[PDB]
C-alpha cells in the first residue's frame, strides 16, 4: 500500500499477451453493426457501427474504444486504415497503458508503427483520474514512445483552471531517458544571507558528457552567481569541473573597498579513473579568488573558521608486482593565523613485490620528494628514501606467527636555512643521513567454545594477539618536520609500526603490544557480537629527537595506551557500536564514541550517538592556539539524535538534534517534512547551526535557514519520499551505522 | 584484438564502463557523480548510483 502501489491503482494495464483482421459482429463495402471487435496485431477496435471500403479501411461510428499495448482511446467518431497502421479518433480522451499519463483532445492520431500520438487542441496531465491538479493543455501535442517526450506547441501550463504560464514551445520528459531542460528550483531564506533562489538548467551534450548552468540570485549581494558544472566520461576516466562566478559583490565592496573589482569565483576539478587496468589518473583541485570566499558562500559569520583548499594531481602505473606514481600536492590555508604551508612538487613512489623467495617475502619502497614553502624564508629540502623488507610467515589452523625485518635509509639536502638558523638554537644541517633498521614479531591464536548453555547452536571465539617492535634511536632535531603528524591509536592502531604519518619523524620503539578479541557466531555461522581490548607496554621511552608534545604526566615507560571496540548486531534492525581510547600521559580518556540505531527500512530509523574528545587531547595534538581559545579548548562532548517516520505513507517527518553537554547549548537542529503525491511533491526544511564565534562578546552565533522545494511527479519512475536526502541536509549528516 | 575478453578497458569511479568483448571494446557500465558542495574550504562530489551492466 506504498506510494508506488497507490499511484499504480488507477493506471490501466494490458491483458492480452504480447505477440489477422478477425471481425466479430451480430449483423455482417460490407457494413457491420451491433457490436464489433477488430484484432490486427496487439491492437483492438471496439464500436457499434463499422463498415469497410476495401479497394482495406474501416470507419467506426459511435462509442469507439481503441485499445493497444501503449494507449487507450475513446470517442464518438473513428477512422482507420488496416495497412498504414493509423487511427483517427475525434474529441474524447486518451490514457497511457502501463504508465500514468492521460488527457483529452479533439483529434487524436496514431501514426507509423504505432509510435506517434498526434494531438490537436489537447491536454496532457500526469495525475490519476479525478484529480486535475495540473495540466499542460496546448495547441498541438506529440507523444513518441522511442525518444519518450511530449512536445507541445503554444503550451499554457495550468495549475487547476489558471494558466500560470505560457510558452511557444515546451517538452516534457515522459520516461527515463536524459533530456535537456529545467530542473528542480529551490527557494531559501537564511538569517545571515537572506532570500536566495536557484534556477538549474540541464544540457545533454552527448551520451558521455553534460552541463548544468544554475543562476543563483542572492538578495543581499544584489547580483547573480553562475554555478556551472561540466561532467565528462572519457577513456581515461570520469570527472567534473565546477566554475562558480559572481561578477560583482555589493557586500564584499563594503568589507574591502580598496579593491578595484569585487568579483568572486571558485574552480573545482575532480577526476578519477583507470585506463587499460594499468594507468591510474586522479585529480582533486580547488582554487578560489580570495581567502574570504569560503566564509561568505557558506553562511559563515566571521573570518574565524580555519580550513584549506587541496590541489592534488597524480599519474600512476600499476602492475601485479610493481607500481610507480608521480604526484604534486599543494594547499592554500585560510586561517587568520600563519598561513604558510609546504607542498610536494613533485613526489615519486615506487613499489616492488616479489613473493616466494624461499620461505620469505620481499618488498621494496622508494620515494623522492621536493618540499617548497609559500614564504621565501622557510627552508626547502629534497628527500630520498629506500625501505627493503623481508617476511617469514608461518601459520596453521589455530595460530600464526610472522617475523619481519626492515631497513630504513633516508637522505636530506636542505637549503634556505639562513633565516631559521639565525633565530633558533637547534641548527638545521645541510645534509642529513638517517639509516636505521627495524625488527617486528607478530603472533596470534584462536580458540573456540560451544556456548550451548545460553543459546542453542552458537559458538564463541577468543583471539589473543601479541606483538614486539624494536626501532633504534636516531637524533632527528636537525631535520625540519615537513609532513609528519602524530597518529591516533584505535584498537587496530595499537599494532601499527609507526607513530607519525610521514618520513620526517620516526620515533624509536621498544614495546610489546597485547590484545584480545571475542566474537560470537550464531547457528548460521553469522557473526553477531565482538569486543576487543588492547594495550601497549613501553620498555623504554619513545624518543623522536624533537620531543615537543605537551603531555600532562611525566610518564615514559609502562602501560600507557589502551583501546577498545564493540559491535553488537542484535537483529536485522538493531545495531550497537562503541570505542574508547585511554592514554595515561593525558590522565584522562583521549577519545570515545558510541552509537545505537534501529532501522526497519529506508523511511523508518532512529539513531542515538555520542562523541567525546578530552581537553587534554586537544592540547597535546592541536596547535598552541587551540589550547587557549574559548571555542577550541573545551574539547568535544555532544549527544546526537536522528529520527524519521512516515505517516499515511505519503508524508515523511525527519528530525535531528545535536547537543554539546559541556556548554549546555545545542550545535545543530533540523526538521524536514515532505509530502509525496502521485503528480507532485513538496519539501520544507529548517536548520539552526553554528556559523562562527563572536570575539567581542565571547559566545557563538547561529544561522537559521528555512527552504522550500517543489517537483513534478509521474513523468519518471520515481516514488520516493525523500527521507534519505533530508537526512543529509545538515552540517552533521546522517551516516548509516547499522 | 590485443587484449582478451572481459579486460576492463576503462574503469571510472569504481566501476568498469568499458570491456573487451571479442577484439573490440563495448560499453559495460555507467557513472553518475555530481557536485555536492563545499566541505569547509574545498569541493566535493557525491555518487548518485554507478553500476555495471
Amino acid at each position: 500500500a506504498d506510494l508506488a502501489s497507490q499511484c499504480m491503482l488507477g493506471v490501466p494495464s494490458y491483458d492480452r499477451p504480447l505477440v489477422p483482421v478477425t471481425i466479430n459482429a451480430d449483423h455482417a463495402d460490407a457494413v457491420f453493426t451491433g457490436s464489433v471487435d477488430i484484432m490486427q496485431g496487439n491492437s483492438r477496435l471496439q464500436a457499434d457501427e463499422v463498415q469497410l471500403h476495401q479497394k482495406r479501411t474501416v470507419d467506426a461510428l459511435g462509442n469507439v474504444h481503441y485499445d493497444d499495448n501503449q494507449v487507450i482511446l475513446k470517442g464518438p467518431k473513428g477512422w482507420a486504415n488496416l495497412n498504414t497502421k493509423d487511427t483517427n479518433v475525434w474529441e474524447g480522451d486518451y490514457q497511457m497503458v502501463g504508465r500514468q499519463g492521460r488527457g483529452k483532445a479533439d483529434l487524436m492520431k496514431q501514426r507509423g508503427e504505432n509510435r506517434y500520438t498526434i494531438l490537436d487542441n489537447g491536454s496532457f496531465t500526469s495525475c490519476l483520474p479525478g484529480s486535475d491538479t495540473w495540466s499542460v493543455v496546448g495547441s498541438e501535442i506529440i507523444h513518441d514512445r522511442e525518444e519518450q517526450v511530449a512536445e507541445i506547441w503554444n503550451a499554457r501550463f495550468k495549475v487547476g483552471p489558471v494558466p500560470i504560464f505560457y510558452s511557444p514551445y515546451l517538452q516534457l520528459p515522459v520516461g527515463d531517458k536524459r533530456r535537456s531542460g529545467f530542473l528542480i528550483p529551490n527557494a531559501k531564506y537564511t538569517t545571515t544571507n537572506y532570500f536566495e533562489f536557484y534556477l538549474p538548467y540541464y544540457w545533454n551534450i552527448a551520451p558521455n558528457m553534460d552541463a548544468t548552468i544554475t543562476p543563483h540570485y542572492m538578495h543581499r549581494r544584489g547580483n547573480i552567481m553562475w554555478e556551472n558544472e561540466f561532467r565528462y566520461l572519457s577513456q581515461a576516466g570520469a570527472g567534473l569541473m565546477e566554475l562558480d562566478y559572481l561578477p560583482s559583490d555589493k557586500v564584499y565592496e563594503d568589507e574591502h573597498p580598496n579593491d578595484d573589482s569585487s568579483r568572486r569565483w571558485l574552480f573545482y576539478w575532480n577526476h578519477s579513473g583507470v585506463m587499460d587496468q594499468v594507468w591510474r589518473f586522479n585529480v582533486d583541485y580547488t582554487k578560489v579568488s580570495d581567502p574570504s570566499y569560503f566564509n561568505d558562500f557558506d553562511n559563515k559569520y566571521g573570518s574565524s573558521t580555519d580550513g584549506y583548499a587541496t590541489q592534488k594531481f597524480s599519474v600512476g602505473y600499476a602492475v601485479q608486482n610493481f607500481n610507480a606514481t608521480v604526484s604534486t600536492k599543494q594547499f592554500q590555508v585560510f586561517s587568520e593565523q600563519n598561513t604558510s604551508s609546504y607542498s610536494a612538487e613533485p613526489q615519486l613512489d615506487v613499489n616492488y613485490y616479489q613473493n616466494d623467495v624461499g620461505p620469505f617475502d620481499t618488498r621494496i619502497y622508494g620515494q623522492a620528494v621536493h618540499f617548497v614553502n609559500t614564504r621565501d624564508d622557510m627552508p626547502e629540502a629534497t628527500r630520498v628514501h629506500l625501505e627493503p623488507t623481508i617476511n617469514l610467515p608461518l601459520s596453521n589452523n589455530w595460530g600464526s606467527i610472522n617475523t619481519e625485518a626492515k631497513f630504513l635509509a633516508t637522505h636530506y639536502q636542505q637549503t634556505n636555512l639562513d633565516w631559521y638558523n639565525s633565530r633558533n638554537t637547534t641548527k638545521l644541517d645541510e645534509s642529513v643521513n638517517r639509516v636505521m633498521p627495524q625488527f617486528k614479531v607478530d603472533g596470534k591464536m584462536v580458540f573456540e567454545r560451544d556456548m550451548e548453555m545460553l543459546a542453542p547452536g552458537y559458538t564463541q571465539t577468543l583471539e589473543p594477539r601479541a606483538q614486539y617492535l624494536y626501532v633504534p634511536y636516531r637524533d632527528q632535531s636537525d631535520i625540519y618536520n615537513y609532513d609528519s603528524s602524530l597518529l591516533q591509536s584505535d584498537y587496530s592502531g595499537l599494532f601499527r609500526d609507526r607513530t607519525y604519518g610521514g618520513l620526517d619523524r620516526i620515533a624509536s620503539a621498544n614495546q610489546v603490544t597485547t590484545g584480545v578479541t571475542s566474537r560470537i557466531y550464531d547457528d548460521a555461522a553469522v557473526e553477531r557480537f565482538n569486543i576487543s581490548v588492547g594495550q601497549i607496554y613501553y620498555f623504554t621511552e619513545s624518543r623522536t629527537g624533537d620531543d615537543n608534545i605537551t603531555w600532562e604526566n611525566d610518564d615514559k615507560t609502562g602501560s600507557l595506551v589502551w583501546a577498545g571496540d564493540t559491535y553488537w548486531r542484535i537483529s536485522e534492525r538493531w545495531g550497537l557500536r562503541g570505542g574508547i581510547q585511554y592514554d595515561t600521559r593525558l590522565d584522562n580518556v583521549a577519545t570515545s564514541n558510541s552509537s545505537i540505531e534501529y532501522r526497519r527500512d529506508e523511511d523508518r530509523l532512529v539513531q542515538l550517538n555520542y562523541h567525546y574528545a578530552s581537553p587534554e587531547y586537544i592540547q597535546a595534538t592541536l596547535p598552541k592556539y587551540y589550547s587557549t581559545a574559548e571555542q577550541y579548548k573545551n574539547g568535544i562532548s555532544q549527544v546526537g539524535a536522528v529520527a524519521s517516520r512516515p505517516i499515511a505513507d505519503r508524508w515523511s517527518i525527519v528530525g535531528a538534534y545535536y547537543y554539546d553537554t559541556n556548554a549546555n547549548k545545542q550545535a545543530d537542529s533540523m526538521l524536514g517534512v515532505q509530502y509525496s503525491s502521485c503528480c507532485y511533491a513538496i519539501r520544507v526544511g529548517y536548520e539552526r547551526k553554528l556559523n562562527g564565534w563572536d570575539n567581542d562578546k565571547q559566545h557563538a552565533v547561529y544561522d537559521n535557514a528555512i527552504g522550500f522545494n517543489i517537483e513534478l511527479r509521474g513523468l519518471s519512475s520515481n516514488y520516493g519520499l525523500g527521507t534519505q536526502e533530508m537526512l543529509r541536509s545538515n552540517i552533521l549528516p546522517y551516516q548509516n551505522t547499522l | 584484438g590485443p587484449r582478451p575478453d572481459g579486460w576492463c578497458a576503462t574503469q571510472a569511479s569504481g566501476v568498469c564502463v568499458a570491456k573487451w568483448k571479442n577484439g573490440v571494446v563495448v560499453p559495460a557500465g555507467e557513472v553518475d557523480v555530481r557536485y555536492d558542495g563545499i566541505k569547509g574550504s574545498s569541493g566535493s562530489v557525491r555518487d548518485y548510483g554507478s553500476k555495471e551492466w
Binding site: 565528462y232 | 557500465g29 557513472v31
Partner: peptide, 11 residues
C-alpha cells in the same frame, strides 16, 4: 523540464 541521469559510452 529535463531529466538528469548517468553517463555512458556511446554505442
Amino acid at each position: 523540464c529535463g531529466l538528469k541521469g548517468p553517463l555512458y559510452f556511446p554505442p
